[PDB]
Amino acid sequence: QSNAMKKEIASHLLEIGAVFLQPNDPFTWSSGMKSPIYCDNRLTLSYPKVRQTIAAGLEELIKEHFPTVEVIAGTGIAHAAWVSDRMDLPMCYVRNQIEGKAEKGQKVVVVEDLISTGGSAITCVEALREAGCEVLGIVSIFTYELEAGKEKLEAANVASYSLSDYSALTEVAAEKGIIGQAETKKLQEWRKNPADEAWITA
Amino acid sequence: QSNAMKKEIASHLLEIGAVFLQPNDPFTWSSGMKSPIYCDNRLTLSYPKVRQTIAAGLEELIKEHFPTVEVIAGTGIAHAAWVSDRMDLPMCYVRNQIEGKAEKGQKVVVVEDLISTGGSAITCVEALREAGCEVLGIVSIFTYELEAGKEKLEAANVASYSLSDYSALTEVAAEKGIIGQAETKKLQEWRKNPADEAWITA
Ligand SMILES: [Cl-]
Ligand SMILES: [Cl-]
Ligand SMILES: [Cl-]
Ligand SMILES: [Cl-]
Ligand SMILES: [Cl-]
Ligand SMILES: [Cl-]
Ligand SMILES: [Cl-]
Ligand SMILES: [Cl-]
Ligand SMILES: [Cl-]
Ligand SMILES: [Cl-]
Ligand SMILES: [Cl-]
Ligand SMILES: [Cl-]
Ligand SMILES: [Cl-]
Ligand SMILES: [Cl-]
C-alpha cells in the first residue's frame, strides 16, 4: 500500500508501455503542449493480471477512503466495471449524460484513468452532483500531480486519491535506469510549470 | 442454456427495464422509425447480479461456440470487461480505432450489447479484420432478429449468437401478461417488415 503500491504500479505501467517518458525529445500533446510524459491507461486492457492488480488497488483505495460508497461511476468504463464487480456495486458512467442509474442522494465514487489538468475530473463530478448524487470523491490510476488539477479539485471540495503518481514514476524510472539525474531535473521543472518550455532545457 | 436461458434472460431484461414494449403506442427511434420495442442494455450496469448472470451467459456462449478465443473486443465495454475478467483474456474495444492490443492473427470474439440492423456489428468486425485479426464471431446480449442484420452477418461470414432474442422476449411478455395475442401479432409483423407501418394496425 501507499509508497510501495505507488512504485509497484509505476513499474508495471512503464513495463507494459502504459506510460512513456521522453524528457530529451518532448512529445507534443493533442493540445499542442510539449510534454516529457504521456499516459494511456487504455493499454492496461490488454494485460489481464496487471489490470486486475490495478482494479484491486482501486478497490483498496475506495475501502480505505470512501467506505460508504453505493455506486461506482466511470468516465475508465472498463476499470469501473472491474471495481464495481469486485465490490458488488451498481455502476454508471458519465460521457454530460449519465448512463446507468445515478439517483438523488446515492453515494458515488468516480473512477478515472488519469488526473491531468483537472478539467475532465471536474466535468464528471459536476454531472453527478447535478443529478443529485453525493460524490464521495475520486480514485484514479495515475496523476501528473499538476498544480492546476490540485487547485480545481480543492476548490470544488473533491477528495482525490491515485494508485500511482508522477513523483513515484520519476523515481522508479531513475532506479530502472530509464532516466538519470539530468532528466529528473527536467521532469521536476515540467510538473511545476508544464506550459513553460524552460523545462526542456532545465 | 438455450431456450431456458433465452427466456430467463428476457424475463430479467423486462424486470429491470432494459427492454420496453409498447406495440399499441409505438416508440419513435432516433432514426425516425416507429417501433414497438426499445432495448437499452446500458441499464444492466446498475444491477450487479443481473449483469453478472449476463456476463456468465456470454462467457458460456464463447466457451460453447468460440473456444479458441484469445482476445475479447467490446463496442459493450463494460460487458466485455466482465467477460474478459472471467476468462482471464486480454480485452480491446472498438470505437474505427481499436483501443488496446489487437494484433495480426489473434483470435477475437466481439461482445455486442444488441444486434439490430447489422450495421454496427459489421462496422466492429470490419475494424478488427482490417487490423489483421481473425474474428471468430460475435456474442450479444439481445437481438431483434431482423432479416437485414441476419443477411449482413451471413454475407460477411460472421457467426453470431445472442443470449436472448425478440422471439423469446415476446413469448415471456405474453406469459407475464404484459402483452396479449393481439399485440403478439403486431410484434410478429414488425420483425418481418420493420420499416413498413402496416404492423401498427396488424
Ligand atoms: Cl490514461
Ligand atoms: Cl498481464
Ligand atoms: Cl494473458
Ligand atoms: Cl465514506
Ligand atoms: Cl453511451
Ligand atoms: Cl483531469
Ligand atoms: Cl457531492
Ligand atoms: Cl442495448
Ligand atoms: Cl441485480
Ligand atoms: Cl445491489
Ligand atoms: Cl473456436
Ligand atoms: Cl477511447
Ligand atoms: Cl447491429
Ligand atoms: Cl475473420
Q: Ligand 9 center to residue B159 CA distance, Å?
A: 30
Q: What is the largest CA-CA distance in chain B?
A: 51
Closest alpha carbon to A183 in A74, A48, A58, A37: A37
Size of interface A-B (CB pairs under 8 A): 68
How many angstroms separate the CA of residue A43 from the nearest CA in chain B?
5
Closest alpha carbon to B76 in B101, B45, B34, B105: B45
Residue A110 pairs with which residues in a beta bridge?
A73, A138
Q: Is A102 helix (H, G, I), strand (E, B) or coil?
A: coil
Return d(Cα A198, Cα B126) in angstroms, integer: 46
Q: What is the largest CA-CA distance in chain A?
A: 51
Q: Are A36 and A199 in contact (CB under 8 A)?
A: yes
Q: Are A78 and B111 in contact (CB under 8 A)?
A: no
- CATH code for the domain in which residue A44 is found: 3.40.50.2020
Contact: A92, B45; criterion CB under 8 Å: yes
B56 touches chain A (CB under 8 A): no
Q: Which residues of B touch A43 (CB under 8 A)?
A: 100-101
Distances (CA, A) of B73 to A24, A133, A175, B134: 36, 32, 36, 12
Angle between helices A48-65 and A77-87 (to 10 degrees): 60
Would you state the torsion angle of the CA atoms of residues A189, A193, A196, A199, taken in this order, to the nearest 10 degrees?
A: 10
Q: Which residues of B touch A52 (CB under 8 A)?
A: 85
Resolution value in angstroms? 1.8
Closest alpha carbon to B113 in B65, B163, B150: B163
Residues 6+ apart with CB under 8 A from B147: B192
Binding site of B, by residue number, is 95, 112-120
Contact: B88, A46; criterion CB under 8 Å: no
B42 touches chain A (CB under 8 A): yes
DSSP state of A193: -
Q: Are B62 and A119 in contact (CB under 8 A)?
A: no
C-alpha cell belonging to residue B63? 466457451
Burial class (CB in 10 A: 0-12, 13-18, 19+), A146: buried
Name the residue of chain A whose CA is nearest to B77's CA: A78
Residue A33, domain extent: 1-202
Return d(Cα B136, Cα B108) in angstroms, integer: 6
How many angstroms separate the CA of residue B44 from the nearest CA in chain A?
7
Name the residue of chain A whose CA is nearest to B53's CA: A85
Of A45, A80, A99, the CB nearest to B100: A45
Return d(Cα A70, Cα A87) in angstroms, integer: 10
Burial class (CB in 10 A: 0-12, 13-18, 19+), B178: middle
Residues 6+ apart with CB under 8 A from B37: B19, B20, B21, B22, B27, B144, B166, B187, B190
Of B42, B78, B92, the CB nearest to A46: B92
Contact: B77, A82; criterion CB under 8 Å: no
Of B85, B92, B93, the CB nearest to A85: B85
Q: Which ligand is nearest to the CA of A68?
A: 4
Residues with CB under 5 A from ligand 7 (ion): A 129, 134-135
Return d(Cα B58, Cα B85) in angstroms, integer: 12
Name the residue of chain B whose CA is nearest to A93's CA: B45
Q: Is A76 helix (H, G, I), strand (E, B) or coil?
A: coil
Contact: B81, A82; criterion CB under 8 Å: yes
Count of domains for chain B = 1
Q: How many CB atoms lie within 10 A of CB A130?
A: 11
C-alpha cell belonging to residue A32? 499542442
Written as one string, the DSSP assignment of chain B is -HHHHHHHHHHHHHHHTSEEE-TTS-EE-TTS-EESEEE-GGGGGG-HHHHHHHHHHHHHHHHHH-TT--EEEE--HHHHHHHHHHHT--EEEE--PEES---TT-EEEEEEEEESSSHHHHHHHHHHHHTT-EEEEEEEEEE---HHHHHHHHHTT--EEEEEEHHHHHHHHHHTTSS-HHHHHHHHHHHH-TT-GGGGG-
B161 touches chain A (CB under 8 A): no
Residues 6+ apart with CB under 8 A from B31: none
